[PDB]
Coordinates of C-alpha atoms and ligand atoms in Angstrom, one line a residue:
Chain A
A5 CA -25.9 -14.9 9.8
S6 CA -22.9 -14.1 7.1
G7 CA -26.6 -13.2 4.4
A8 CA -27.7 -10.4 7.6
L9 CA -24.0 -9.2 8.6
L10 CA -23.5 -8.2 4.7
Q11 CA -26.9 -6.4 4.8
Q12 CA -25.4 -4.6 8.1
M13 CA -22.6 -3.6 6.2
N14 CA -24.2 -2.3 3.4
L15 CA -26.9 -0.4 6.0
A16 CA -23.6 1.0 7.7
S17 CA -22.1 2.3 4.3
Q18 CA -25.4 4.3 4.0
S19 CA -25.8 6.2 6.9
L20 CA -22.9 6.1 9.2
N21 CA -20.6 9.7 9.6
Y22 CA -17.1 7.8 8.5
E23 CA -13.7 8.0 6.4
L24 CA -12.3 5.4 4.8
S25 CA -8.6 6.0 3.8
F26 CA -7.9 3.2 2.3
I27 CA -5.9 1.6 -1.0
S28 CA -6.6 0.0 -4.5
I29 CA -4.4 -2.2 -5.6
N30 CA -4.3 -4.2 -8.9
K31 CA -2.4 -4.4 -11.9
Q32 CA -1.2 -1.1 -12.3
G33 CA 0.2 -1.0 -8.7
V34 CA -1.5 0.6 -5.3
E35 CA -3.4 3.3 -5.2
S36 CA -3.9 5.6 -2.2
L37 CA -7.9 6.9 -2.0
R38 CA -10.1 8.5 0.9
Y39 CA -13.5 7.8 1.0
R40 CA -15.7 10.2 3.2
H41 CA -19.4 9.6 4.4
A42 CA -22.1 11.7 5.9
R43 CA -25.7 12.4 6.0
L44 CA -26.7 15.6 6.5
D45 CA -30.5 17.1 5.5
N46 CA -31.9 12.8 5.1
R47 CA -29.6 13.2 2.1
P48 CA -26.2 11.5 1.4
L49 CA -23.2 13.5 1.4
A50 CA -19.7 11.6 0.3
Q51 CA -16.1 12.7 -1.4
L52 CA -13.9 10.6 -3.4
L53 CA -10.3 11.6 -3.3
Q54 CA -7.3 10.5 -5.6
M55 CA -4.5 11.3 -2.8
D56 CA -1.2 11.7 -4.9
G57 CA -0.5 13.3 -8.0
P58 CA -3.4 15.3 -9.5
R59 CA -6.5 16.6 -7.4
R60 CA -8.6 13.8 -9.0
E61 CA -11.6 14.4 -6.8
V62 CA -15.5 13.2 -7.0
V63 CA -18.2 14.1 -4.5
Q64 CA -22.1 13.4 -4.1
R65 CA -24.6 15.1 -2.5
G66 CA -27.9 13.6 -2.9
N67 CA -27.9 12.3 -6.2
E68 CA -25.7 14.9 -7.7
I69 CA -22.7 13.2 -8.5
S70 CA -20.2 15.9 -9.6
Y71 CA -16.7 15.1 -11.4
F72 CA -13.1 16.8 -10.5
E73 CA -10.0 16.8 -12.6
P78 CA -15.4 19.5 -14.4
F79 CA -19.4 18.4 -14.8
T80 CA -21.5 17.0 -12.9
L81 CA -24.6 13.9 -13.3
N82 CA -27.2 11.2 -10.8
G83 CA -26.2 8.8 -9.7
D84 CA -27.3 6.9 -6.0
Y85 CA -24.0 6.2 -5.3
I86 CA -20.3 7.2 -6.1
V87 CA -18.6 4.5 -8.6
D88 CA -15.8 2.1 -9.5
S89 CA -13.3 2.1 -6.9
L90 CA -15.1 2.5 -3.4
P91 CA -16.5 -0.9 -3.8
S92 CA -19.7 -1.3 -5.7
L93 CA -20.4 -4.3 -3.3
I94 CA -20.9 -1.9 -0.6
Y95 CA -24.3 -0.6 -2.4
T96 CA -25.2 -3.6 -2.9
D97 CA -28.7 -5.6 -2.0
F98 CA -28.0 -8.4 -0.2
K99 CA -31.6 -9.3 -0.2
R100 CA -32.0 -9.6 -3.6
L101 CA -28.5 -11.4 -4.1
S102 CA -29.3 -14.2 -1.7
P103 CA -31.8 -16.8 -3.9
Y104 CA -28.7 -17.3 -6.4
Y105 CA -25.5 -16.5 -4.2
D106 CA -23.5 -18.1 -1.3
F107 CA -22.8 -16.2 0.9
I108 CA -20.2 -18.2 3.3
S109 CA -18.6 -17.6 6.2
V110 CA -14.4 -17.6 6.5
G111 CA -14.4 -17.1 10.0
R112 CA -12.9 -13.8 11.5
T113 CA -9.7 -12.1 11.3
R114 CA -7.5 -8.5 12.3
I115 CA -7.3 -5.8 9.3
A116 CA -7.0 -2.5 10.2
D117 CA -6.5 -2.5 14.2
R118 CA -10.2 -4.5 13.9
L119 CA -11.5 -8.1 14.6
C120 CA -13.5 -8.8 11.2
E121 CA -16.1 -10.9 10.1
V122 CA -14.7 -12.6 7.1
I123 CA -17.4 -14.0 3.8
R124 CA -17.4 -14.8 0.6
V125 CA -19.7 -14.0 -2.2
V126 CA -20.3 -16.8 -4.6
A127 CA -22.8 -17.2 -7.3
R128 CA -24.0 -20.5 -6.9
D129 CA -24.2 -21.8 -10.5
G130 CA -20.0 -21.0 -10.6
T131 CA -20.5 -18.4 -13.6
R132 CA -19.0 -15.4 -12.1
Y133 CA -16.1 -14.6 -10.3
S134 CA -16.4 -14.3 -6.2
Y135 CA -15.4 -11.5 -3.6
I136 CA -14.3 -11.9 0.0
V137 CA -15.2 -9.1 2.8
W138 CA -13.9 -8.6 5.8
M139 CA -16.1 -6.0 7.5
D140 CA -15.6 -5.1 10.9
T141 CA -17.3 -6.5 13.9
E142 CA -18.3 -3.2 15.7
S143 CA -18.6 -0.8 12.5
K144 CA -19.9 -3.1 10.2
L145 CA -17.5 -0.9 7.5
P146 CA -16.0 -3.5 4.8
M147 CA -12.0 -2.8 6.2
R148 CA -11.1 -5.2 2.9
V149 CA -12.2 -6.7 0.3
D150 CA -10.6 -9.0 -3.0
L151 CA -12.1 -9.3 -6.0
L152 CA -11.6 -13.1 -7.8
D153 CA -11.0 -15.3 -10.4
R154 CA -12.8 -18.6 -11.2
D155 CA -9.2 -20.0 -10.6
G156 CA -9.0 -17.9 -7.0
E157 CA -6.5 -15.5 -8.7
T158 CA -6.9 -11.4 -7.4
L159 CA -8.2 -9.2 -9.3
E160 CA -8.4 -6.3 -7.5
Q161 CA -8.0 -5.6 -3.5
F162 CA -9.6 -3.0 -1.7
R163 CA -8.0 -2.3 1.8
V164 CA -8.6 0.4 4.7
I165 CA -5.3 1.4 6.0
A166 CA -7.0 3.8 8.7
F167 CA -10.1 4.9 9.4
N168 CA -12.6 6.8 12.0
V169 CA -16.3 6.4 12.4
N170 CA -19.0 8.1 14.0
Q171 CA -17.2 11.3 14.6
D172 CA -18.7 14.9 13.2
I173 CA -18.2 15.9 9.8
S174 CA -15.5 17.6 8.2
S175 CA -15.7 21.6 7.6
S176 CA -15.1 20.0 3.5
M177 CA -17.9 18.4 4.1
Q178 CA -19.9 20.9 6.2
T179 CA -18.9 22.8 3.1
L180 CA -19.5 20.4 0.1
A181 CA -23.0 20.7 1.7
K182 CA -24.1 24.4 0.5
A183 CA -21.9 24.6 -2.3
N184 CA -23.0 25.0 -6.0
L185 CA -21.5 22.2 -8.0
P186 CA -21.8 22.2 -11.8
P187 CA -25.1 20.1 -12.8
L188 CA -25.6 18.8 -16.4
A197 CA -35.6 1.4 -28.1
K198 CA -36.3 -2.5 -29.4
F199 CA -34.3 -4.0 -30.4
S200 CA -34.1 -7.5 -32.8
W201 CA -32.0 -10.0 -30.7
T202 CA -31.6 -11.0 -27.3
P203 CA -29.6 -13.1 -25.6
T204 CA -30.8 -16.8 -25.1
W205 CA -28.6 -17.5 -22.2
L206 CA -27.7 -15.6 -19.4
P207 CA -25.7 -16.5 -16.4
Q208 CA -29.0 -17.3 -13.3
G209 CA -29.8 -13.7 -11.4
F210 CA -28.9 -11.5 -14.3
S211 CA -31.7 -8.5 -15.9
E212 CA -31.9 -6.3 -18.1
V213 CA -31.1 -2.3 -16.3
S214 CA -31.5 -0.6 -20.2
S215 CA -31.7 -0.4 -24.0
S216 CA -30.1 2.2 -25.8
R217 CA -28.8 2.9 -29.5
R218 CA -25.9 5.1 -29.9
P219 CA -24.4 5.9 -33.4
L220 CA -20.6 5.4 -33.6
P221 CA -17.7 8.4 -34.4
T222 CA -17.6 7.4 -37.9
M223 CA -18.0 8.4 -41.2
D224 CA -21.3 6.4 -41.8
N225 CA -23.4 7.2 -38.6
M226 CA -23.5 3.0 -37.9
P227 CA -25.9 2.3 -34.7
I228 CA -24.5 0.2 -31.9
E229 CA -27.7 -1.3 -29.8
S230 CA -26.7 -2.3 -26.6
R231 CA -28.1 -4.0 -23.6
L232 CA -26.8 -3.2 -20.5
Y233 CA -27.0 -6.4 -17.9
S234 CA -27.0 -6.3 -13.7
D235 CA -27.3 -9.3 -11.4
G236 CA -27.3 -6.8 -8.8
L237 CA -23.4 -6.9 -8.3
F238 CA -21.9 -7.8 -11.4
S239 CA -22.5 -6.2 -14.4
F240 CA -22.3 -6.1 -18.2
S241 CA -23.1 -4.6 -21.7
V242 CA -24.3 -5.9 -25.0
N243 CA -23.0 -4.5 -27.8
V244 CA -24.3 -5.2 -31.5
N245 CA -23.1 -3.5 -34.7
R246 CA -22.9 -4.5 -38.5
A247 CA -20.3 -6.3 -38.8
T248 CA -17.0 -5.3 -41.6
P249 CA -14.5 -7.0 -43.3
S250 CA -12.4 -5.8 -39.8
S251 CA -14.5 -7.2 -37.7
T252 CA -12.8 -10.3 -35.9
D253 CA -13.2 -12.9 -33.0
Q254 CA -10.9 -11.6 -30.2
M255 CA -11.2 -11.4 -26.0
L256 CA -9.4 -8.6 -24.1
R257 CA -9.0 -9.5 -20.1
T258 CA -7.5 -6.3 -18.6
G259 CA -8.5 -6.6 -14.2
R260 CA -12.5 -6.3 -14.0
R261 CA -12.9 -5.7 -18.1
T262 CA -13.6 -8.6 -19.9
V263 CA -14.0 -7.3 -23.4
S264 CA -15.4 -10.2 -25.6
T265 CA -15.7 -9.5 -29.3
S266 CA -17.1 -12.5 -31.5
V267 CA -18.6 -12.3 -35.3
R268 CA -21.4 -13.9 -36.0
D269 CA -23.7 -13.7 -39.4
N270 CA -23.4 -10.2 -40.1
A271 CA -23.2 -8.7 -36.4
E272 CA -19.9 -8.0 -34.7
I273 CA -21.3 -9.0 -30.8
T274 CA -19.0 -7.1 -28.5
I275 CA -19.0 -8.5 -24.6
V276 CA -17.9 -5.7 -21.6
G277 CA -18.0 -5.5 -18.1
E278 CA -17.0 -7.9 -14.7
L279 CA -17.3 -11.5 -16.4
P280 CA -15.0 -14.6 -16.4
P281 CA -13.5 -14.4 -20.5
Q282 CA -15.4 -18.4 -20.6
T283 CA -19.0 -16.7 -19.8
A284 CA -19.0 -13.7 -22.0
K285 CA -18.3 -16.0 -24.7
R286 CA -20.6 -18.5 -23.3
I287 CA -23.7 -14.9 -23.9
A288 CA -21.6 -13.9 -27.2
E289 CA -22.6 -17.0 -29.0
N290 CA -26.1 -17.4 -27.6
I291 CA -27.7 -14.6 -28.3
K292 CA -31.1 -15.3 -31.2
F293 CA -31.5 -12.5 -33.9
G294 CA -34.4 -12.0 -35.9
Chain B
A2 CA 13.0 32.2 -2.5
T3 CA 12.9 28.0 -1.4
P4 CA 15.6 26.4 0.0
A5 CA 18.7 23.8 -1.2
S6 CA 18.0 20.4 -0.7
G7 CA 20.1 20.1 2.3
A8 CA 17.6 22.3 4.5
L9 CA 14.7 20.8 3.5
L10 CA 15.9 17.7 4.7
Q11 CA 17.2 18.5 7.9
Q12 CA 13.7 20.4 8.4
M13 CA 12.5 17.0 7.6
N14 CA 14.8 15.2 10.9
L15 CA 13.8 17.7 13.0
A16 CA 10.2 17.2 12.3
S17 CA 10.4 14.0 13.1
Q18 CA 12.1 14.3 16.3
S19 CA 9.6 16.9 17.9
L20 CA 6.6 16.8 16.8
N21 CA 3.7 14.9 18.0
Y22 CA 2.1 12.4 15.0
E23 CA 0.8 9.5 13.6
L24 CA 1.2 8.0 10.3
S25 CA -0.3 5.4 8.6
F26 CA 1.2 4.0 5.8
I27 CA 2.0 1.2 4.1
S28 CA 5.8 -0.7 3.2
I29 CA 6.2 -2.1 -0.3
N30 CA 8.9 -5.0 -0.9
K31 CA 8.8 -8.1 -2.2
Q32 CA 7.0 -9.8 0.3
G33 CA 4.1 -7.3 -0.6
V34 CA 2.2 -4.8 1.2
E35 CA 2.4 -4.4 4.6
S36 CA 0.3 -1.7 6.9
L37 CA 1.8 0.1 9.6
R38 CA 1.1 2.8 11.7
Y39 CA 3.8 4.5 13.6
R40 CA 2.9 7.2 16.5
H41 CA 5.4 10.0 18.1
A42 CA 5.4 12.3 20.7
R43 CA 7.3 13.8 23.5
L44 CA 6.7 13.7 26.8
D45 CA 8.3 14.5 29.5
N46 CA 11.1 15.6 27.5
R47 CA 11.6 12.3 26.3
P48 CA 10.6 10.2 23.1
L49 CA 7.6 8.4 22.9
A50 CA 6.8 5.9 20.0
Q51 CA 4.8 2.9 18.8
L52 CA 4.9 0.6 15.4
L53 CA 2.0 -1.4 15.8
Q54 CA 1.4 -4.4 12.6
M55 CA -2.3 -3.4 11.1
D56 CA -3.2 -6.4 9.9
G57 CA -2.5 -10.5 11.1
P58 CA -0.7 -11.0 14.8
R59 CA -0.8 -7.9 16.6
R60 CA 3.1 -7.2 16.5
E61 CA 4.1 -4.2 18.3
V62 CA 7.2 -2.1 19.3
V63 CA 7.6 0.4 21.8
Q64 CA 9.7 3.1 22.3
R65 CA 10.1 5.2 25.8
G66 CA 13.0 7.1 25.9
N67 CA 16.3 4.5 25.2
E68 CA 14.3 1.5 26.1
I69 CA 13.0 -0.6 23.2
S70 CA 9.7 -3.1 24.1
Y71 CA 9.1 -5.8 20.8
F72 CA 5.6 -7.0 21.8
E73 CA 4.5 -10.7 20.1
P74 CA 2.0 -13.3 19.5
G75 CA 2.1 -15.3 22.4
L76 CA 4.8 -14.8 23.3
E77 CA 7.2 -13.5 26.6
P78 CA 8.0 -9.1 25.4
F79 CA 11.3 -8.2 25.5
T80 CA 13.4 -4.8 26.2
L81 CA 16.2 -3.4 24.6
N82 CA 17.9 -0.2 24.4
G83 CA 18.1 1.8 21.2
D84 CA 17.5 5.1 19.8
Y85 CA 14.7 4.8 17.8
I86 CA 12.2 1.8 16.2
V87 CA 14.3 -0.6 13.6
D88 CA 12.1 -1.6 10.2
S89 CA 9.6 1.2 10.9
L90 CA 10.5 4.6 9.2
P91 CA 12.8 4.2 6.9
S92 CA 16.4 5.3 8.4
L93 CA 16.9 8.0 6.3
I94 CA 14.5 9.8 8.1
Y95 CA 16.7 10.0 11.6
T96 CA 19.5 10.7 9.0
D97 CA 22.3 14.1 10.3
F98 CA 22.1 15.5 6.8
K99 CA 24.7 18.2 7.7
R100 CA 26.7 15.7 8.0
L101 CA 25.8 13.6 5.4
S102 CA 26.4 16.7 2.9
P103 CA 29.8 16.3 2.5
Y104 CA 29.8 12.9 0.5
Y105 CA 25.8 12.9 -0.6
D106 CA 24.3 15.2 -3.1
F107 CA 20.9 16.5 -2.9
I108 CA 19.0 17.0 -5.4
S109 CA 15.4 18.8 -6.3
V110 CA 13.7 17.2 -8.8
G111 CA 10.3 20.0 -7.7
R112 CA 7.0 19.2 -6.3
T113 CA 3.7 16.8 -6.2
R114 CA 1.8 15.8 -4.3
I115 CA 1.7 13.0 -2.0
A116 CA -1.2 12.2 0.6
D117 CA -3.0 15.2 -0.1
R118 CA -0.2 17.6 0.5
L119 CA 2.1 19.4 -1.4
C120 CA 6.1 18.0 -1.2
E121 CA 9.3 18.6 -2.4
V122 CA 10.4 15.7 -4.0
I123 CA 14.7 15.7 -3.4
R124 CA 17.1 12.7 -4.3
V125 CA 19.5 11.7 -1.7
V126 CA 22.7 9.8 -3.3
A127 CA 25.9 9.9 -2.5
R128 CA 28.5 11.4 -4.7
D129 CA 31.2 8.4 -5.6
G130 CA 28.6 6.3 -6.9
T131 CA 29.2 3.4 -4.5
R132 CA 25.9 2.8 -2.7
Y133 CA 21.9 3.1 -3.1
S134 CA 20.0 5.9 -3.0
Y135 CA 16.6 7.5 -1.9
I136 CA 14.0 9.3 -3.4
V137 CA 12.1 11.6 -0.7
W138 CA 8.5 13.2 -0.6
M139 CA 8.4 15.8 1.7
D140 CA 5.3 17.4 2.9
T141 CA 5.2 21.0 3.1
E142 CA 3.7 22.3 5.7
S143 CA 4.8 19.5 8.6
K144 CA 8.0 18.5 7.1
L145 CA 6.8 15.4 7.7
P146 CA 7.9 12.2 5.2
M147 CA 5.1 11.2 2.7
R148 CA 6.8 8.6 0.7
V149 CA 10.2 7.2 0.6
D150 CA 11.7 4.8 -1.9
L151 CA 15.0 3.3 -1.5
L152 CA 16.6 3.2 -5.0
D153 CA 19.0 0.5 -6.9
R154 CA 22.2 2.1 -8.6
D155 CA 20.1 0.7 -11.5
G156 CA 17.0 2.8 -10.4
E157 CA 14.9 -0.1 -9.7
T158 CA 13.0 0.0 -6.3
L159 CA 13.8 -2.1 -3.5
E160 CA 11.4 -0.8 -0.7
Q161 CA 8.6 1.9 -0.6
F162 CA 7.3 3.4 2.2
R163 CA 4.1 5.2 1.6
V164 CA 1.6 7.4 4.0
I165 CA -1.8 6.9 3.5
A166 CA -3.3 9.0 6.0
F167 CA -1.8 11.5 8.5
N168 CA -2.2 13.2 10.9
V169 CA 0.1 16.3 13.2
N170 CA -0.1 18.1 15.5
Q171 CA -2.9 16.6 17.4
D172 CA -3.1 15.6 21.4
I173 CA -1.0 12.4 22.7
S174 CA -3.5 9.9 22.4
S175 CA -4.6 8.3 25.3
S176 CA -3.3 4.8 24.3
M177 CA 0.1 6.8 24.0
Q178 CA -0.6 8.5 27.5
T179 CA -0.9 4.9 29.3
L180 CA 2.4 4.0 27.5
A181 CA 4.3 6.6 29.1
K182 CA 3.2 5.3 32.7
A183 CA 3.2 1.5 31.5
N184 CA 5.1 -1.5 33.5
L185 CA 7.3 -1.9 30.7
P186 CA 9.1 -5.5 29.9
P187 CA 12.5 -5.7 31.7
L188 CA 15.9 -5.3 30.1
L189 CA 17.0 -7.7 28.7
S190 CA 21.0 -7.5 29.2
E195 CA 34.8 -7.4 23.4
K196 CA 35.8 -3.4 23.7
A197 CA 38.8 -4.9 21.8
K198 CA 41.5 -3.8 18.8
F199 CA 42.3 -5.7 15.5
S200 CA 45.1 -7.0 14.0
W201 CA 43.4 -6.4 10.2
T202 CA 41.8 -2.9 9.3
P203 CA 39.7 -1.8 5.6
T204 CA 42.4 -0.1 3.1
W205 CA 39.0 1.3 1.0
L206 CA 36.0 2.4 2.3
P207 CA 33.0 4.5 0.6
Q208 CA 33.7 8.3 1.1
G209 CA 32.0 9.2 4.3
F210 CA 31.9 5.7 6.3
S211 CA 33.7 5.8 9.6
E212 CA 33.9 2.7 12.2
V213 CA 31.4 3.0 15.1
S214 CA 32.2 0.0 16.9
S215 CA 34.2 -2.9 17.9
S216 CA 33.3 -6.1 18.9
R217 CA 35.2 -9.6 19.6
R218 CA 32.6 -12.3 20.1
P219 CA 32.7 -16.6 20.4
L220 CA 31.5 -18.3 17.5
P221 CA 28.2 -20.8 18.5
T222 CA 30.4 -23.5 17.8
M223 CA 32.7 -26.7 19.6
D224 CA 35.6 -24.1 19.4
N225 CA 34.9 -21.4 20.7
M226 CA 36.2 -19.5 17.7
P227 CA 36.5 -15.9 18.0
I228 CA 34.7 -13.4 15.1
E229 CA 36.0 -9.8 15.5
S230 CA 33.7 -7.4 13.6
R231 CA 34.1 -3.2 12.8
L232 CA 30.7 -1.6 12.9
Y233 CA 30.5 0.8 10.1
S234 CA 28.1 4.2 9.2
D235 CA 28.0 6.7 7.1
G236 CA 24.8 7.8 8.8
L237 CA 23.0 6.8 6.5
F238 CA 24.1 3.2 5.4
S239 CA 26.1 0.9 7.7
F240 CA 27.8 -2.8 7.5
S241 CA 30.1 -4.4 9.5
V242 CA 33.0 -6.5 8.2
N243 CA 33.5 -10.0 10.2
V244 CA 37.0 -11.5 9.9
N245 CA 37.3 -15.0 11.5
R246 CA 39.6 -17.7 11.0
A247 CA 39.2 -19.5 7.8
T248 CA 38.1 -23.4 7.7
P249 CA 38.9 -25.8 4.9
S250 CA 34.8 -24.9 4.5
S251 CA 35.0 -21.6 4.2
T252 CA 33.7 -20.1 -0.2
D253 CA 33.6 -17.2 -1.0
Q254 CA 29.7 -15.8 -2.1
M255 CA 27.2 -13.5 -2.2
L256 CA 24.0 -13.0 -1.4
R257 CA 21.2 -10.1 -1.9
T258 CA 17.7 -10.3 -0.7
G259 CA 16.3 -6.7 -0.5
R260 CA 19.0 -4.0 1.4
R261 CA 20.9 -7.4 3.5
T262 CA 24.2 -8.5 1.2
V263 CA 26.5 -10.7 2.6
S264 CA 29.0 -11.2 0.9
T265 CA 32.1 -13.8 2.4
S266 CA 35.2 -13.6 0.5
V267 CA 38.3 -15.9 2.3
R268 CA 41.4 -14.3 1.7
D269 CA 44.8 -16.2 3.3
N270 CA 43.9 -17.6 6.7
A271 CA 40.9 -15.3 6.8
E272 CA 36.9 -15.4 6.4
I273 CA 36.1 -12.0 5.9
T274 CA 31.8 -11.7 5.6
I275 CA 30.6 -8.1 4.7
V276 CA 26.9 -7.5 6.2
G277 CA 25.0 -4.6 5.4
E278 CA 22.8 -2.4 3.2
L279 CA 25.6 -1.4 0.1
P280 CA 25.9 -3.2 -3.7
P281 CA 27.0 -6.0 -3.8
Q282 CA 30.2 -4.6 -5.8
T283 CA 30.9 -2.3 -3.4
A284 CA 31.0 -4.9 -0.5
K285 CA 33.2 -7.5 -2.4
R286 CA 36.0 -4.3 -2.7
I287 CA 35.5 -3.6 0.7
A288 CA 36.5 -7.2 2.0
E289 CA 38.8 -7.8 -1.1
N290 CA 40.8 -4.7 0.5
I291 CA 41.3 -5.2 4.2
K292 CA 45.4 -5.2 5.4
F293 CA 46.3 -7.6 8.1
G294 CA 49.4 -6.7 10.5
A295 CA 49.1 -3.2 9.9
Ligands
LIG301 C1 -7.6 -20.5 -17.1 C2 -7.5 -18.7 -17.9 N1 -7.8 -17.9 -17.5 C3 -8.2 -17.7 -19.0 C4 -7.2 -16.7 -16.9 C5 -9.7 -18.6 -16.7 C6 -9.5 -17.7 -15.2 C7 -10.6 -18.2 -14.8 S1 -11.9 -17.0 -15.0 O1 -13.0 -18.0 -15.4 O2 -12.7 -16.9 -13.6 O3 -11.5 -16.1 -15.8
LIG302 C1 24.6 -5.4 -12.3 C2 23.1 -6.4 -12.5 N1 22.9 -6.3 -11.0 C3 24.0 -6.4 -9.8 C4 21.9 -7.4 -10.6 C5 22.3 -5.0 -10.7 C6 22.3 -4.3 -9.0 C7 23.0 -2.8 -9.1 S1 23.8 -2.3 -8.1 O1 23.2 -3.6 -6.9 O2 24.9 -1.3 -7.7 O3 22.6 -1.5 -7.0

């Protein structure tokens, strides 16, 4: 029951005290991170630290996420390294994802269940998760191409679980932190599972205050934005894929459509070229 | 009010040999990113160590005094004599920097954060431009190595050692305490002078041992070996009787260079952590009948 195992991983991630020492591998290279999580006063407490170079820090205290290099904002979880699929509602996903068992294997000196998370309609990237058989915490996570090429890799190098909370986190618990629309277009085609999260109109940083209209879509796991703005003679069709960011611009009619998010290029384009106007 | 680079390096060496610690590190090279764990302690005025491969089959290597035991996937384990576990730590760590200094330069490149620690950054370069070099990041408190790169003469990195998490001075683990008293696999099993010597060696190198060994051939063809080291890098000069099938060739993989040259009736093959150019220069400077 992979579905159940994945739900358990999510739950372990949200409710245990733990420290993960892990590396993030992608085209940029091998980055060294530390994540600490705890529960204190029935409230989440977390720290993501960049280990090498300048001291980039991010902390979570309840729904306050404070960033450091010096602000804070609201959110239910730290984003985009610590594998956002760890905070995924897998019950929400099951109708349109397959969870596939690929057996057990040693990662980080632990026996792990290995599970593929694939969207049924062949439309998105996929994950494969190695989870600790005891703690249920994620030991390794690969983000994969539709062609099986790896875009991003999360690998735990050392960890501990169930220990009492660091002086750091014990401090952070009390320490004071920094604290801080209707469109004329819709997408006619979205991959099975996606639904709108928010809409916004934003003035572009240009001499004309030219609006850009954005819809944020998510399927509980992957997310992207559809951005529309009035076309100019300098607007062009183009595709850029780096890692998990695809930027797909297409010009249709008098509009500049740009899709930004975790999507195979093909899918982004298919969305772009299915927006109905008027 | 900060020490010369050589004093720092000596400190790191000392820290490595006398502290109890655990390094969780990755070694990066053309193979990929491999995840290792190294534990070191001293118990009964004796070294105690464990190198564990963290992913896949459970490859383990352990040190107890001067015995090194090798544990493997579905294999009978064995023990050898050795002063330290190899392919663990970069060899750089066991180095005697007092010894190296007449022929190496130790160059400060400042301080930087590795593994949430302020580190001194130091290049270790051989003065005669003859070898690969290292750059070390060393924890400013513990003195332990936090990162180590081995570099081409062109600055390309051949191998990288990076600690991801570590602890120091913490109690010797009950796993390690078990090892001290554990049953180790039984220890598993020539002294001569030759007619040839290398006339050119990089500044610093000196002979470690000599041996004559019968090759695994129908004729019991001897092969004569001199092991050289400079305290950091090491190589062997191997001579054997040339055959019609003996050819000049160079193979460099990572930090193994195999350089064969045939001069006169001899097949000379140099094996070790040396730039190809240097290996060849040694091979083609052996005299015979000295
Ligand atoms: C086939 C070549 N590219 C564009 C990289 C496609 C890779 C597969 S996909 O759809 O997941 O991006
Ligand atoms: C000079 C070109 N090659 C041999 C490829 C670069 C290696 C330089 S080396 O071996 O001395 O570091």
